[PDB]
Paper text:
The Maltose-Binding Protein (MBP) is a component of the Escherichia coli maltose/maltodextrin system, which regulates the uptake and catabolism of maltrodextrins as part of the chemotactic response. Subsequently, this tendency to crystallize has been further increased by an MBP version engineered to reduce surface entropy13(MBPeng). Here we report two passenger protein sequences that promote the formation of an intimately interlaced dimeric form of MBPeng, featuring the largest interface area observed to date for domain-swapped proteins. The fragments of interest being relatively short (28 and 49 residues for FAK(residues 805–832) and PYK2(residues 790–839), respectively), we decided to produce them as C-terminal MBP fusion proteins.
To understand the molecular basis for the observed dimerization, we crystallized the protein fractions corresponding to the dimeric species of MBPeng-KFLFAK and of MBPeng-KFLPYK2. Both fusion proteins crystallized under several conditions. Those of MBPeng-KFLFAK belonged to space group P1 and diffracted to a maximum resolution of 2.0 Å. During model rebuilding and refinement, it became apparent that adjacent MBP molecules formed the same intricately interlaced arm-exchange dimers in both MBPeng-KFLFAK and MBPeng-KFLPYK2 crystals, (harbouring two and three dimers per ASU, respectively). Instead of a tight β-turn at residues 173–176, the protein chains adopted an extended β-strand structure, crossing straight into the second MBP structure for both MBPeng-FAKKFL and MBPeng-KFLPYK2. This β-strand pairing is stabilized by six intermolecular backbone hydrogen bonds between residues 171 and 178 of both chains. Because MBP’s polypeptide chain goes back and forth between its N-terminal and C-terminal lobes, this chain crossing resulted in highly intertwined dimers, where the two domains of both MBP molecules are constituted by both polypeptide chains. This structural architecture produced an extremely high contact surface between both chains (~11,300 Å2), corresponding to a calculated solvation free energy gain (∆iG) of −174.5 kcal/mol. Following structural refinement, clear electron density was only found for the Asn-Ala linker and the first (in the KFLPYK2 crystal) or the first five (KFLFAK) passenger protein residues. The Tm of MBPeng-KFLFAK monomer (60.1 ± 0.43 °C) and dimer (59.0 ± 0.49 °C) were lower than MBPeng alone, demonstrating that these particular passenger sequences further destabilized the fusion protein.
Numbering used by the authors:
A (entry chain B): 5 to 373
B (entry chain A): 6 to 371
């Protein structure tokens, strides 16, 4: 019953795509049918939900937003290693309401096309076109002709100095929507409290107790960060560092801290700062110099991370970071931490149930704003 | 000219100074690396009188507060530079849709395990109770970590859908159309002026422009990869390049990304993913399609690097990176229709620039 029906426009290389289909079939036994029906982008929303639509549709990204609005497309979830194989801006094109809803294939935009016999070296600027046209008109030619009837062609110029269709409103933390009190949080906290109730952990275990027990070889596992590594290195323990365990088949989501270099808005040296950071520091040699002095852990620069991640501990830090959440960069985090500290302690000890501790934390977090 | 850099005393500040010294050797500009106590508290105190360091190093989360006070300069790296760092690290230094710092390093909790006690650690939290029973029979325990601090316990709590504050995704704002602002008027006025001064004709359309270029009557045109084959058939030896700037800013062509979507109702979603990821989005897969009918520039970096040996493709990609992604919402239909009318009417004598854009603003909205 497994098969793939693929829709692509008749002006694309659908025979080429079929050849890829045939390779798939040869490897998997699964038959791939490539079709190019007329009006396929109109037909798709008509048939897709009924159980007679294609499995895969190829079209320009802009139409997929409308499809996504109707819930016609499956959220895709490629691994980080796969996402990194495509240009970031192409993933931006297939994002809707913060979800990836397609795979990017190809990229098209307008360019400046010029006659090399008439103009061996074309102009850099729009402003130089009037004079260039005067010069060419003296030989009975013109500088520039393009389609003025269709805004697609004239928009690039119009947009240049601040024209736009729709303002993209940036993503934002919503401080009135706290998630300490939902089903997911209750499940995780209940598992934790149950580990305590069942005597697999003690409620009063803290940083030092855990560190000592691990470094003295009394416990098989601990949860900690790169700051703890050197203390373990000096111990007798042969340790590894790995991805955190899943809970209900989902990754554990540690908060991620990103050591960042900000440029003072009042600095008269902003161009120097940019030059230093981009071209001296954020290079393999620059990060190496810093790392050698005191380890950075995992780094944001791909080329150097690929070198550092030969150490599995660094690889694991990065893997956990990619599965985690970026620490929110807002003042209200203080209220969250305080409320949550209390909730876990009270649940861990039996002073409150899980539901009442999280309920109280939800109300405290919001009220402390 | 100089650079004073602040970084915490627990970081590799001597290493950073060595980088500073290399900068000085090349530029003649001295870099001073300092690690004052409480530097993250000091910065908003002295930056806000305007006498602080030029560069400050700290964890990204503190920079949100700084950015709220306008203490940090918006950074604008080129596309080629942004691509050198992991996307998610740029997300960490974004505030109100602006990049406010450069990401350096990445820190997170991991599972640390004793290889002599446990050569292969558990993949699941659920398997820990049984593992602990087994280890307790030898006088050991499975797992000990800091239960007092939510930083350490949150990973588990978050796993099944706990979160601090809902991040509401970025979104096109349909009540905010920008066809009628100073920038749009500037661009359109320059265009109308090209017409008024007889450097272009109001009536020029796709076919007229294509014919004139392909017959060697005009030095330049603006067009996409779809037009190339018709030029190839002409006598004209052509090049393809980056669009001209206007007021020293890039022309921003709309970018179309040919995309493959998976039907939400499909019972074959895992097959689709396998086909797309591991057969199609590879060099050999894209080559098969490309050989049949050219794709132009491609999203797959490894194959784009091969295709971009053709300067025309390189130029398409360069323009695409400087352009704007075509908004993926239905309301674009209203924008195009309104704007089509505005440009035609301004280009002709039929309306002024201001009145044509004003009418288009009102037509787009609704």
């Amino acid at each position: 019953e497994g098969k793939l029906v693929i829709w692509i426009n008749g002006d694309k290389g659908y025979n080429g795509l079929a050849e890829v289909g045939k390779k798939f079939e040869k490897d998997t036994g699964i038959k791939v049918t490539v079709e190019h029906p007329d009006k396929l982008e109109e037909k798709f929303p008509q048939v897709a939900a009924t159980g007679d639509g294609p499995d895969i549709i190829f079209w320009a990204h802009d139409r997929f937003g409308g499809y996504a609005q109707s819930g016609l497309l499956a959220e895709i979830t490629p691994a980080a290693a796969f996402q990194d194989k495509l240009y970031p801006f192409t993933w931006d094109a297939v994002r809707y309401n913060g979800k990836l809803i397609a795979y990017p294939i190809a990229v098209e935009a307008l360019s400046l096309i010029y006659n090399k016999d008439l103009l061996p070296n074309p102009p850099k600027t729009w402003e130089e076109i009037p004079a260039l046209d005067k010069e060419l008109k003296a030989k009975g030619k013109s500088a520039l002709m393009f389609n003025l009837q269709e805004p697609y062609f004239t928009w690039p110029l119009i947009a240049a100095d601040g024209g736009y269709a729709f303002k993209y409103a940036a993503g934002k933390y919503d401080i009135k929507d706290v998630g300490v009190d939902n089903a997911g949080a209750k499940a995780g906290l209940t598992f934790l409290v149950d580990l305590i109730k069942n005597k697999h952990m003690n409620a009063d275990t803290d940083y030092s107790i855990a560190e000592a027990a691990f470094n003295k070889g009394e416990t098989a596992m601990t949860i900690n960060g790169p700051w703890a590594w050197s203390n373990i290195d000096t111990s007798a323990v042969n340790y590894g560092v790995t991805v955190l365990p899943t809970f209900k088949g989902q990754p554990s989501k540690p908060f991620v801290g990103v050591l960042s270099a900000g440029i003072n808005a009042a600095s008269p040296n902003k161009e120097l700062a940019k030059e230093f950071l981009e071209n001296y520091l954020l290079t393999d040699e620059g990060l190496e110099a810093v790392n050698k002095d005191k380890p950075l852990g995992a780094v944001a620069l791909k080329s150097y991370e690929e070198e550092l991640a030969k150490d599995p501990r660094i690889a694991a830090t990065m893997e956990n970071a990619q599965k985690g959440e970026i620490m929110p960069n807002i003042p209200q985090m203080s209220a969250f931490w305080y409320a949550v500290r209390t909730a876990v302690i009270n649940a861990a000890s039996g002073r409150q149930t899980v539901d009442a501790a999280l309920a109280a934390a939800q109300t405290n977090a919001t009220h402390l704003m």
